[PDB]
Swiss-Prot record:
It is found in: Golgi apparatus, trans-Golgi network membrane; Cell membrane; Melanosome membrane; Early endosome membrane. Widely expressed including in heart, brain, lung, muscle, kidney, pancreas, and to a lesser extent placenta. Expressed in fibroblasts, aortic smooth muscle cells, aortic endothelial cells and umbilical vein endothelial cells (at protein level). ATP binds at E35. Monomer. Interacts with PDZD11. Interacts with ATOX1 and COMMD1. Interacts with TYRP1. Directly interacts with SOD3; this interaction is copper-dependent and is required for SOD3 activity. Belongs to the cation transport ATPase (P-type) (TC 3.A.3) family. Type IB subfamily. The nucleotide-binding domain consists of a twisted six-stranded antiparallel beta-sheet flanked by two pairs of alpha-helices, forming a hydrophobic pocket that interacts with the adenine ring of ATP. The ATP binding site comprises residues located in alpha-1 and alpha-2 helices and beta-2 and beta-3 strands, which are involved in van der Waal's interactions, and Glu-35 which forms a hydrogen bond with the adenine ring. The heavy-metal-associated domain (HMA) coordinates a Cu(+) ion via the cysteine residues within the CXXC motif. The transfer of Cu(+) ion from ATOX1 to ATP7A involves the formation of a three-coordinate Cu(+)-bridged heterodimer where the metal is shared between the two metal binding sites of ATOX1 and ATP7A. The Cu(+) ion appears to switch between two coordination modes, forming two links with one protein and one with the other. Cisplatin, a chemotherapeutic drug, can bind the CXXC motif and hinder the release of Cu(+) ion. This is Copper-transporting ATPase 1. The chain holds residues 1051 to 1231 of 1500 of the full protein.
Amino acid sequence: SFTMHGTPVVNQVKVLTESNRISHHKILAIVGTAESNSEHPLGTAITKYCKQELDTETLGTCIDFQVVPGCGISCKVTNIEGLLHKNNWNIEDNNIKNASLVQIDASNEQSSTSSSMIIDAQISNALNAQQYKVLIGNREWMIRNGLVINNDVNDFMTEHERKGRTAVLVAVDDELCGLIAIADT
């Protein structure tokens, strides 16, 4: 029923900045953990590639995820260094639903209420990590953001899109940082 088309793979990822603003490993993390969201089968494929290259389950960052089709993604990311044994008490399930009413005239099988939220919990811990603004999109949206591309990589990306496969750059707070080549197959 649900499957009809072939499934893509992440093929090559390459760095495009030195450790001056952000280092290669910290870039690999924020690129991967930004797809811990609920977007597409490629997000599961990115997170699965990245977490296996990290060789640790110790990831998962809050993201202000914004999306434009045919152009790219923009997000605000936090909790990067915060993978640690926390300053808090690890209370992430505790909630007080405080329900009311039960009837014969309503015949069971209702939605069931919810109350409480995960408030104040991160505010003791969040001082352990930097907050970053991160953007992922094609060469044509990067130059429109106010960034500039280099001709050596622009040829490789041109040739990859001519080969009918999907190609994007990564940037952080108005600096270049990497590229991603994904095989449509």
